[PDB]
Design an enzyme around this catalytic site. Structure first.
Site, PDB file in Angstrom:
ATOM      1  N   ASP A 102       0.834  -1.200   0.000  1.00 28.33           N
ATOM      2  CA  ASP A 102       0.000   0.000   0.000  1.00 28.33           C
ATOM      3  C   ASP A 102       0.865   1.244   0.000  1.00 28.33           C
ATOM      4  O   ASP A 102       0.615   2.187   0.753  1.00 28.33           O
ATOM      5  CB  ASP A 102      -0.995   0.000   1.184  1.00 28.33           C
ATOM      6  N   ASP A 160       2.764   2.986   7.244  1.00 23.53           N
ATOM      7  CA  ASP A 160       1.532   2.355   6.756  1.00 23.53           C
ATOM      8  C   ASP A 160       0.398   2.613   7.745  1.00 23.53           C
ATOM      9  O   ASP A 160       0.492   2.238   8.917  1.00 23.53           O
ATOM     10  CB  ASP A 160       1.739   0.849   6.553  1.00 23.53           C
ATOM     11  N   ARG A 180       0.053   9.172   1.148  1.00 25.79           N
ATOM     12  CA  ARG A 180      -0.633   9.157   2.459  1.00 25.79           C
ATOM     13  C   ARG A 180       0.059   8.231   3.457  1.00 25.79           C
ATOM     14  O   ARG A 180      -0.093   8.392   4.655  1.00 25.79           O
ATOM     15  CB  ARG A 180      -2.124   8.782   2.323  1.00 25.79           C
ATOM     16  N   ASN A 181       0.840   7.275   2.959  1.00 25.85           N
ATOM     17  CA  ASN A 181       1.571   6.352   3.827  1.00 25.85           C
ATOM     18  C   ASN A 181       3.048   6.712   4.004  1.00 25.85           C
ATOM     19  O   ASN A 181       3.839   5.885   4.456  1.00 25.85           O
ATOM     20  CB  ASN A 181       1.402   4.902   3.342  1.00 25.85           C
TER      21      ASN A 181
HETATM   22  C1  LIG Z   1       0.733   6.917  14.545  1.00 25.67           C
HETATM   23  C2  LIG Z   1       1.382   5.970  13.531  1.00 25.67           C
HETATM   24  C3  LIG Z   1       0.656   4.842  13.120  1.00 25.67           C
HETATM   25  C4  LIG Z   1       1.180   3.925  12.208  1.00 25.67           C
HETATM   26  C5  LIG Z   1       2.463   4.145  11.704  1.00 25.67           C
HETATM   27  C6  LIG Z   1       3.115   3.184  10.692  1.00 25.67           C
HETATM   28  O1  LIG Z   1       3.872   3.655   9.843  1.00 25.67           O
HETATM   29  N1  LIG Z   1       2.827   1.870  10.831  1.00 25.67           N
HETATM   30  C7  LIG Z   1       3.282   0.848  10.057  1.00 25.67           C
HETATM   31  C8  LIG Z   1       2.513  -0.310   9.938  1.00 25.67           C
HETATM   32  C9  LIG Z   1       2.930  -1.393   9.156  1.00 25.67           C
HETATM   33  C10 LIG Z   1       4.144  -1.326   8.479  1.00 25.67           C
HETATM   34  C11 LIG Z   1       4.935  -0.173   8.587  1.00 25.67           C
HETATM   35  C12 LIG Z   1       6.282  -0.058   7.834  1.00 25.67           C
HETATM   36  F1  LIG Z   1       7.241   0.327   8.681  1.00 25.67           F
HETATM   37  F2  LIG Z   1       6.156   0.874   6.888  1.00 25.67           F
HETATM   38  F3  LIG Z   1       6.607  -1.214   7.233  1.00 25.67           F
HETATM   39  C13 LIG Z   1       4.496   0.902   9.363  1.00 25.67           C
HETATM   40  C14 LIG Z   1       3.179   5.274  12.116  1.00 25.67           C
HETATM   41  C15 LIG Z   1       2.660   6.214  13.016  1.00 25.67           C
HETATM   42  N2  LIG Z   1       3.445   7.268  13.378  1.00 25.67           N
HETATM   43  C16 LIG Z   1       3.225   8.604  13.280  1.00 25.67           C
HETATM   44  C17 LIG Z   1       4.269   9.493  13.614  1.00 25.67           C
HETATM   45  N3  LIG Z   1       4.104  10.815  13.547  1.00 25.67           N
HETATM   46  C18 LIG Z   1       2.945  11.350  13.152  1.00 25.67           C
HETATM   47  C19 LIG Z   1       1.850  10.539  12.805  1.00 25.67           C
HETATM   48  C20 LIG Z   1       0.493  11.123  12.337  1.00 25.67           C
HETATM   49  N4  LIG Z   1       0.457  12.436  12.087  1.00 25.67           N
HETATM   50  O2  LIG Z   1      -0.488  10.388  12.206  1.00 25.67           O
HETATM   51  C21 LIG Z   1       2.003   9.150  12.866  1.00 25.67           C
END
Ligand SMILES: Cc1ccc(C(=O)Nc2cccc(C(F)(F)F)c2)cc1Nc1cncc(C(N)=O)c1
Length: 275
Positions: free
Chosen positions: A151, A169, A155-156
Site C-alpha cells: 500500500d 503504513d 498518504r503512507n
Molecule cells: C501513529 C502511527 C501509526 C502507524 C504508523 C506506521 O507507519 N505503521 C506501520 C505499519 C505497518 C508497516 C509499517 C512499515 F514500517 F512501513 F513497514 C508501518 C506510524 C505512526 N506514526 C506517526 C508518527 N508521527 C505522526 C503521525 C500522524 N500524524 O499520524 C504518525
C-alpha cells in the site's frame, strides 16, 4: 531478513521478539492527533540519562478482546524488524498491565500528501527529488529485507521537521500494479508501480491520482495504455521514470536500487532531469 509474524504459532511471541516492552510511566501523552483500534497522540518518552524524545503514540481503546489486541500489536511485530533512516522507527510497546500502546518516532509534518497540499508550489525540484530519493531508499531497504509493502502511497509516507520522508503504513486500486489488482501478485515489482504513483503525487503536490476517475475507469484506461502525464513543472526525465515504473510487464520496471541511482544523478546534475 523479514519474518512474517503470522508464521509464528503464537502471535505474541513475535511481539516480544521484535518490540521492546516500555514502562508506561515513562510515556507522556500530550495531544490527540488522529482517531483504528484507538486514538493517535503525540507525546514524549523518557530515556534513562538521555533527554526525552518526541513520540507518536497509537493507543488501543479499552474494551478490546484478546483477538483485537493481537491484530493491533501485529503492527509492532512488523515495524520493529526494521532499522533504516527512511523507514519509520518503533520505540516500543506496552502490551500488558497498562493501557496498550504502540510507541513510534514522531514525525512533525505528518502524512506527505496532506503536507504537500498545504505547501503547494513551495518546494524546488531538487527538494522534491530529495523527498522521492528518501522514499526510494526506504523501499530499497524493505525490498532487500524481503518485505512487500502493498500500500505504498503518499498518504503512507511521514515527514519530519527536516523534510526527511519515511515509509509507513496507516492500514487502493489507483496505487496498485495491474497484476496485483487482477491476480493478487504482490511483489517488490508491484511496489515499484506504486512508487511511480507516489512520484506523481509528490510532483503534483498531493493531487489525487487519476483525479475523479472511478476505480473501474482507472483499470480500463491503464489496460488501454493510458498513463498519467507530467505534472506542472515536472521535468521530462522524472516523468519518464514514472513511465518506467508503470510498465505493464513487471520485469521491465526498474528496481529500487536503480531508482535511487537515477534520482542521485538528478540531485547531482539537476539538468539531467529534463533529458
Ligand atoms: C501513529 C502511527 C501509526 C502507524 C504508523 C506506521 O507507519 N505503521 C506501520 C505499519 C505497518 C508497516 C509499517 C512499515 F514500517 F512501513 F513497514 C508501518 C506510524 C505512526 N506514526 C506517526 C508518527 N508521527 C505522526 C503521525 C500522524 N500524524 O499520524 C504518525
Amino acid at each position: 531478513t523479514y519474518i512474517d509474524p503470522e508464521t509464528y504459532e503464537d502471535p505474541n511471541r513475535a511481539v516480544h521478539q521484535f518490540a521492546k516492552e516500555l514502562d508506561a510511566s515513562c510515556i507522556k501523552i500530550e495531544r490527540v492527533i488522529g482517531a483504528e483500534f484507538g486514538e493517535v497522540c503525540s507525546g514524549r518518552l523518557k530515556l534513562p540519562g538521555k533527554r526525552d524524545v518526541a513520540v507518536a503514540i497509537k493507543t488501543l481503546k479499552v474494551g478490546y478482546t484478546e483477538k483485537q489486541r493481537r491484530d493491533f500489536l501485529c503492527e509492532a511485530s512488523i515495524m520493529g524488524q526494521f532499522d533504516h533512516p527512511n523507514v519509520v522507527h518503533l520505540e516500543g510497546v506496552v502490551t500488558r498491565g497498562k493501557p496498550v500502546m504502540i510507541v513510534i518516532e514522531f514525525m512533525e509534518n505528518g502524512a506527505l500528501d496532506a503536507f504537500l497540499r498545504k505547501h503547494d508550489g513551495q518546494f524546488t525540484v531538487i527538494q522534491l527529488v530529495g523527498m522521492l530519493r528518501g522514499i526510494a531508499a526506504g523501499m530499497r531497504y524493505l525490498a532487500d529485507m524481503g518485505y512487500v509493502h502493498r500500500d505504498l502511497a503518499a498518504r503512507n509516507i511521514l515527514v519530519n521537521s527536516n523534510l526527511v520522508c519515511k515509509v509507513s503504513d496507516f492500514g487502493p486500486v489507483r496505487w496498485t500494479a495491474p497484476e496485483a489488482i487482477q491476480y493478487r501478485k504482490f511483489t517488490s515489482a508491484s511496489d515499484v508501480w506504486s512508487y511511480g504513483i507516489v512520484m506523481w503525487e509528490v510532483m503534483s503536490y498531493g493531487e489525487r491520482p487519476y483525479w475523479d476517475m472511478s476505480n473501474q475507469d482507472v483499470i480500463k484506461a491503464i489496460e488501454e495504455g493510458y498513463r498519467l502525464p507530467a505534472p506542472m513543472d515536472c521535468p521530462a526525465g522524472l516523468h519518464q521514470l514514472m513511465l518506467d515504473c508503470w510498465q505493464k510487464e513487471r520485469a521491465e520496471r526498474p528496481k529500487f536500487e536503480q531508482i535511487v541511482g537515477i534520482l542521485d544523478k538528478m540531485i547531482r546534475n539537476p539538468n539531467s532531469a529534463h533529458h
